[PDB]
Amino acid sequence: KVTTVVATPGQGPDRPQEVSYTDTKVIGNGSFGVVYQAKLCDSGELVAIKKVLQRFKNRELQIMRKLDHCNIVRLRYFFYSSGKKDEVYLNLVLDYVPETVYRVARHYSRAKQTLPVIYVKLYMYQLFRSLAYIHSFGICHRDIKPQNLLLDPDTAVLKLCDFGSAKQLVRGEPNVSYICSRYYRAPELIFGATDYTSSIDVWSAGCVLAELLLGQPIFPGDSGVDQLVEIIKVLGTPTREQIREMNPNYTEKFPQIKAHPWTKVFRPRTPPEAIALCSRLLEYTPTARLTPLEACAHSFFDELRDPNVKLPNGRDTPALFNFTTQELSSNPPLATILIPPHARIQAA
Amino acid sequence: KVTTVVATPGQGPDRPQEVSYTDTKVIGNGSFGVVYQAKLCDSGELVAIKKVLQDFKNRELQIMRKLDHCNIVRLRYFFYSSEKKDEVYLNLVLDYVPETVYRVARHYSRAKQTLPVIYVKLYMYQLFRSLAYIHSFGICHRDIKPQNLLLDPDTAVLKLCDFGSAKQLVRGEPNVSYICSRYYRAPELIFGATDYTSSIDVWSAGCVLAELLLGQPIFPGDSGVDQLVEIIKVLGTPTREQIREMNPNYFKFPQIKAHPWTKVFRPRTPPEAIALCSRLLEYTPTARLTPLEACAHSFFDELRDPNVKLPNGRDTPALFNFTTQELSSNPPLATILIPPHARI
Numbered sequence: 001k002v003t004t005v006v007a008t009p010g011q012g013p014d015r016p017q018e019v020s021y022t023d024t025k026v027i028g029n030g031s032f033g034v035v036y037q038a039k040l041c042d043s044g045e046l047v048a049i050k051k052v053l054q055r056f057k058n059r060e061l062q063i064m065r066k067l068d069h070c071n072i073v074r075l076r077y078f079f080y081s082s083g084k085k086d087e088v089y090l091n092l093v094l095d096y097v098p099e100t101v102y103r104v105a106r107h108y109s110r111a112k113q114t115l116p117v118i119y120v121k122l123y124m125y126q127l128f129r130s131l132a133y134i135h136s137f138g139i140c141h142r143d144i145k146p147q148n149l150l151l152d153p154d155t156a157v158l159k160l161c162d163f164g165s166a167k168q169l170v171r172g173e174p175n176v177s178y179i180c181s182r183y184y185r186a187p188e189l190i191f192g193a194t195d196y197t198s199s200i201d202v203w204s205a206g207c208v209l210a211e212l213l214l215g216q217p218i219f220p221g222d223s224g225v226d227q228l229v230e231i232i233k234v235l236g237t238p239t240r241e242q243i244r245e246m247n248p249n250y251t252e253k254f255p256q257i258k259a260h261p262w263t264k265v266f267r268p269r270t271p272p273e274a275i276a277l278c279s280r281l282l283e284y285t286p287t288a289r290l291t292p293l294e295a296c297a298h299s300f301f302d303e304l305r306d307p308n309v310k311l312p313n314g315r316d317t318p319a320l321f322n323f324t325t326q327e328l329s330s331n332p333p334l335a336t337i338l339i340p341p342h343a344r345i346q347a348a
Numbered sequence: 349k350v351t352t353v354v355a356t357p358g359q360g361p362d363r364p365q366e367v368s369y370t371d372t373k374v375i376g377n378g379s380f381g382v383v384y385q386a387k388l389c390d391s392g393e394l395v396a397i398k399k400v401l402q403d404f405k406n407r408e409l410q411i412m413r414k415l416d417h418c419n420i421v422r423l424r425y426f427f428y429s430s431e432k433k434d435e436v437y438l439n440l441v442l443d444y445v446p447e448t449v450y451r452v453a454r455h456y457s458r459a460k461q462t463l464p465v466i467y468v469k470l471y472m473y474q475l476f477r478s479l480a481y482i483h484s485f486g487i488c489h490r491d492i493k494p495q496n497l498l499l500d501p502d503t504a505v506l507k508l509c510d511f512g513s514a515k516q517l518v519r520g521e522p523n524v525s526y527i528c529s530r531y532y533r534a535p536e537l538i539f540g541a542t543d544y545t546s547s548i549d550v551w552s553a554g555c556v557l558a559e560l561l562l563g564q565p566i567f568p569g570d571s572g573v574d575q576l577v578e579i580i581k582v583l584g585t586p587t588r589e590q591i592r593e594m595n596p597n598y599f600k601f602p603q604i605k606a607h608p609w610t611k612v613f614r615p616r617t618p619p620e621a622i623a624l625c626s627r628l629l630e631y632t633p634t635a636r637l638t639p640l641e642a643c644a645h646s647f648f649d650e651l652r653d654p655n656v657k658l659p660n661g662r663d664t665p666a667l668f669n670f671t672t673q674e675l676s677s678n679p680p681l682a683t684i685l686i687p688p689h690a691r692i
């Protein structure tokens with residue numbers, strides 16, 4: 001069965017064209033609508049088709065049309081379709097990716113093993129590249145969690161997906177505080193900040209890292225203040241200064257506790273660079289957190305810059321040094337750390 | 349610091365009156381708005397105040413106004429107020445309960461222990477009674493999960509809360525497919541059913557029981573079809589008939605044999621717990637026990653023993669004060685549910 005629609009390509013000229021697809025199968029339902037898998041007839045490539053029910057322009061579409069990066073799911077095409085009367089659906093044709101960081105972590109947890117640190121480095125590094133890319137546009141993802149990090153098992157390529165929560169943060173324009181997935185929600189958000197920055201994604205990324213080291217979510221909070229209590233149980237109670245920086249409008253009730261040492265949080269053999277990276281991502285003070293490009297340059301990722309590095313299956317490392325000007329724009333001189341001599345494109 | 353508002357009683361004649369409270373503290377911010385704890389002035393009772401942004405009559409209010417049961421958070425009063433500029437907020441004054449099943453289960457998990465069996469019996473029994481009461485009005489909760497089961501640790505009383513997803517189900521009137529919390533979501537929902545019934549709450553209850561026996565969620569699915577794959581890894585692949593029963597309208601899932609229930613749980617798991625769980629977690633919605641049937645299941649036999657006592661030595665909470673409303677799905681079951689020693 002072949003379906004043909006008029007669609008606009010995600011990138012390039014804003015010109016509609018005929019696109020045809022087959023082997024249409026539902027791969028999930030959601031609050032937004034339905035997601036299908038299908039095969040493009042022209043190339044034969046697998047794609048996902050996210051069908052979203054639409055007063056306002058679709059923010060997810062506006063954000064997605066601007067993005068093209070190796071560590072983000074690419075919007076191939078979009079097109080409109082109809083459902084009841086006056087119901088309009090936006091259809092996003094996206095790269096298909098079979099696995100997630102959530103499923104890989106769950107596999108290891110069930111086998112009572114932690115993910116080898118090399119995979120933790122590979123996944124986190126790619127996530128940081130994706131964050132550096134989107135943050136350059138002022139776009140904050142606001143839903144960083146293992147479920148939204150797609151993986152191709154063979155190549156170990158990670159791609160960030162689900163821009164349904166994403167927003168361009170503009171200084172002085174307030175934003176909703178109840179926004180990320182709860183275990184990954186930055187403390188400023190729990191304190192009711194509406195003037196928060198993209199650094200909320202970095203906290204989320206820190207939670208993912210810690211999770212991949214621990215074998216389970218580091219802050220598995222219940223509803224209410226209990227999420228904040230879980231955080232305090234590791235970082236300790238925030239000072240009044242830290243509270244001010246998180247939310248200058250903080251409306252005054254949590255327990256007073258001293259920080260548990262980071263080294264004691266993780267398993268005894270956890271590499272010290274991993275703990276050091278976590279401690280620089282999971283800071284109460286939003287401005288104290290590493291930027292994504294600074295995270296990529298951290299010594300925890302030194303192994304990925306070693307010329308002799310191979311994946312456990314013997315297959316080639318995925319692309320790690322094809323940096324874009326978007327990613328490098330916050331600190332171009334850091335490219336001498338990030339891209340070692342063996343990976344440097346040569347003058348020829 | 350005393351606040352005074354004009355509020356209508358949740359139940360009773362709809363006559364506004366003045367209510368005063370002190371010691372207001374925020375205990376939570378959610379998608380709906382804010383939840384506070386406060387102390388009623390004249391009586392000194394701790395209450396919760398759940399402030400919901402409103403617009404169209406509030407479903408949750410309409411539902412809570414019909415309910416009065418020992419295992420359900422009671423709506424004492426409701427009033428209106430004003431965060432959002434032009435926006436009206438509904439305020440529900442509710443029973444306050446300090447703990448949740450989520451927090452108690454996490455406590456035992458971090459200790460590498462499981463909840464003692466008597467508490468599994470007490471909490472699951474109280475859940476089933478709460479479900480029997482609401483189902484008798486045709487009301488489906490649609491968000492049964494450990495977070496929504498409040499616990500008083502001293503009395504072992506359980507109370508169901510958060511009627512935010514609840515709806516009166518009416519045959520022939522369609523309902524949304526994507527509704528419970530994912531780990532507790534019934535398989536007909538995953539298959540996009542719109543003509544489902546109250547039995548989706550019983551599935552959820554089965555997931556809660558399985559979690560209390562296991563020490564973790566039984567089906568921790570990823571997004572999409574992976575949740576069904578999790579279920580299939582235990583119940584085995586559903587048959588054509590089972591699929592038709594879940595949804596007689598209209599996925600790639602593997603053809604796997606069912607895993608035996610006794611192997612799913614740890615070796616000294618009480619066999620009556622496993623038998624109860626196998627009768628809740630069934631593909632076919634009609635094959636699941638109804639809540640009243642569940643309350644009467646033999647796993648709860650120990651609770652009907654006149655010598656039963658809590659481990660702290662205290663007497664068990666009210667278990668047998670069944671009303672006509674509560675018994676109405678199968679009134680004859682009262683000969684089991686009200687033991688001779690509890691009768692007049």
Ligand SMILES: O=c1c(O)c(-c2ccc(O)cc2O)oc2cc(O)cc(O)c12
Nearest residue numbers: 223224376377383396443444445509510
């Ligand atoms: O409905 C409740 C609720 O949504 C919540 C709730 C509280 C905090 C939060 O962050 C989210 C919640 O759903 O708490 C309750 C506490 C009570 O004692 C009684 C209740 O009915 C609730």
Ligand SMILES: O=c1c(O)c(-c2ccc(O)cc2O)oc2cc(O)cc(O)c12
Nearest residue numbers: 028029035048073095096097161162572
């Ligand atoms: O954005 C995606 C998505 O929301 C989902 C998704 C799928 C099923 C579901 O139940 C919920 C989802 O968010 O899947 C994707 C798969 C891809 O290969 C690429 C994507 O961008 C998505």
